[PDB]
Design a protein around this ligand. Structure first.
Ligand SMILES: [Cl-]
Ligand SMILES: [Cl-]
Lengths: 209, 215
């Protein structure tokens, strides 16, 4: 199954189209897989156009006679991978030769999440508030903690993981450690993440789901 | 949650055999099609084999037919790939996978199979004679760390054949071969006669001559 192109270099935000010409008959609908380096393939599309559960809506598949296409409508940095098409018959499975999608490095903003302490942990006398910055680049981002709008200092620690690839991103956790007393006597908890000219603050109110 | 967990990979010799396992959990593979798919280093996915539910019909890629056997044990909820007569082209990460939605929805983590393929010429070390053995001394050559088989050994370019014992090679844990060749000679000859073992390793286009002297 010739795939086209065999490799391509693109930028974040680009629309990417990968073609797969059928080696088996066309009634044997195609499936598409994504394989990150050093990892098992992941199913994206089955029956030419059906999105497998959990796969993002930016992936879509279609057919035109003997021609099956995978489209990534808006490339994300986590889409760096080799993509494979496949037809299945009762006696024979065939893969396309693969299309390596390389993505130019650029700034990636973090997805920010804030987590209140659990009721279970408050029984220990301590409250941990956790802020997650997921999949960002480059390394430099500033975390500032606020409690009823008072900037905190000296009571948070950070930790960083890197994906260890070519288009690898960072993720970062910041943990604010408070006594149960302090946690219970204040209401608004906010994690502000500053990268470049953007700051994003995620917050919660104690006791308000 | 559904999971496939593989085991069994490693380093093996050409012509050798290996068995890979694919342990299913969260489902019974009795009612599913299971497959093996492989990926040679830096290359694309290649289907290897499949086995069908209930009747255990099997299908193989042409490259592995007659050498690989796929099977499944429903009581152990495990599928297997028996790999015989291995070739250099079989080096790959091997994946097992379950057939789901006209496709392969769950995949194992992969296990690496490496078929030894590195040609290496031998190192030849002397087995030196003392003397403490009465009137007859032993000496020889240790032929270490070559691949693949074979090497041939003569002594004094073939002029010395009486008393020679060249042992079968042994496969070392490294995957490389080693052997020794020894000869018994009169102790009186040690001061005067030269003894040289000639080791030919055609696969690496290497010949080694080693003069063996008393230490
Ligand atoms: Cl760091
Ligand atoms: Cl309150």
């Amino acid at each position: 199954m010739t795939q086209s192109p065999s490799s391509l270099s693109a930028s974040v935000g680009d629309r990417v189209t990968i073609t797969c010409r059928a080696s088996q008959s066309v009634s044997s609908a195609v499936a598409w897989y994504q394989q990150k380096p050093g990892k098992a393939p992941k199913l994206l599309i089955y029956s030419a156009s059906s999105l497998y559960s959990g796969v993002p809506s930016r992936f879509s598949g279609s057919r035109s006679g003997t021609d099956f296409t995978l489209t990534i409508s808006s490339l994300q940095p986590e889409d760096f991978a080799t993509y494979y098409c496949q037809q299945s018959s009762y006696s024979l499975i065939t893969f396309g030769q693969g299309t390596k999608v390389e993505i130019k490095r650029t700034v990636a903003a973090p997805s920010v999440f804030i987590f209140p302490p659990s009721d279970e942990q408050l029984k220990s006398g301590t409250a941990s508030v956790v802020c997650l910055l997921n999949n960002f680049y480059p390394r430099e981002a500033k975390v500032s903690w606020y409690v009823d709008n008072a900037l905190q200092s000296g009571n948070s620690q950070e930790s960083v993981t890197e994906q260890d690839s070519k288009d690898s991103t960072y993720s970062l956790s910041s943990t604010l450690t408070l006594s149960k007393a302090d946690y219970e006597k204040h209401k608004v908890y906010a994690c502000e993440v500053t990268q470049g000219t953007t700051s994003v603050t995620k917050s919660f109110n104690r006791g308000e789901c | 949650e559904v999971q496939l967990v593989e085991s069994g990979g490693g380093l093996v010799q050409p012509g050798g055999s290996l068995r890979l396992s694919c342990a299913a959990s969260g489902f019974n593979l009795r009612s599913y099609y299971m497959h093996w798919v492989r990926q040679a280093p830096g290359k694309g996915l290649e289907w290897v084999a499949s086995i069908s539910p209930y009747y255990s019909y099997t299908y193989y890629a042409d490259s592995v037919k007659g050498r690989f056997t796929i099977s499944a044990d429903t009581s152990k909820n495990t599928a297997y790939l028996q790999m015989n007569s291995l070739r250099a082209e079989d080096t790959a990460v091997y994946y097992c996978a379950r057939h789901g939605y006209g496709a392969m929805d769950y995949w194992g983590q992969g296990t690496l199979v490496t078929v030894f393929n590195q040609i290496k010429g031998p190192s030849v070390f002397p087995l030196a004679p003392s003397s403490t053995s009465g009137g007859t001394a032993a000496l020889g050559c240790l032929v270490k760390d070559y691949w693949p088989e074979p090497v041939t050994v003569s002594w004094n370019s073939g002029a010395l054949t009486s008393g020679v014992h060249t042992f079968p090679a042994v496969l070392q844990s490294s995957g490389l071969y080693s052997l020794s060749s020894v000869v018994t000679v009169p102790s009186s000859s040690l001061g005067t006669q030269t003894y040289i073992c000639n080791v030919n390793h055609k696969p690496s286009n290497t010949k080694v001559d080693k003069k063996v002297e008393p230490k």
